[PDB]
Amino acid sequence: ETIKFVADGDIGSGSVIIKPFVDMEHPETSIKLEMDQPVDLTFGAKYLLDIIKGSSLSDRVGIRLSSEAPALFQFDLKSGFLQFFLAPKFN
């Protein structure tokens, strides 16, 4: 159904909402999502900023999320990949 990014900090708060969809002209700008379970997870911005560096390696980013383990972020190469496992915050 819905993917929701939320930063709620000192000076204020910000909120981005995206929906899964299929694209016609550029199918590589589509937003894919399969949801077995609702997730609700907080991550350090510090680290996501190191992670996003891999944008310069692949068009798409593949995210796997779980309450049981570290989240996985993946940028695929032509015959290869670069993965980032990041543990969410306890509280």
């Binding site: 929701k4 939320v6 399969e34 999320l65 015959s79 993965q83």
Partner: protein
Amino acid sequence: MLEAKFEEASLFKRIIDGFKDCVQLVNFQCKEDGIIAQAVDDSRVLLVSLEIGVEAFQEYRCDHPVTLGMDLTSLSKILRCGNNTDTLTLIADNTPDSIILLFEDTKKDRIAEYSLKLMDIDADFLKIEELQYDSTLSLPSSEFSKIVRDLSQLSDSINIMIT
């Protein structure tokens, strides 16, 4: 005895950026079917796993599994001699003190040869990927880039929520 030819040095330079700014040292495992490399940050909350197959190179030949681990801030300095559009080659031997980095481009004029001295790192290799995750999604990497960059302004702490 390793020889691996990236068709454009840009690629490898870009891959090292993924480790730098978040990790210091790293073992690079070279085997018949390509290169893999793993690193864990200081606080141990971030793992970086790299895999590059044979098909990502121009030429590639490795007739013997060889670990060459190295300081990344040292390695990136050599990568600054990069050009991005130069044909980069990596050379090693049976048990190497140094990896050899070899740049070339379109005119036969410019072949530079660099050499980085290797180190001993203890390989505590980690397989932490689960079978099943609660949710999986994929979107443009540039789009993700912005969301993180943006929300990083407001807080040290971004919260992802799928329902």
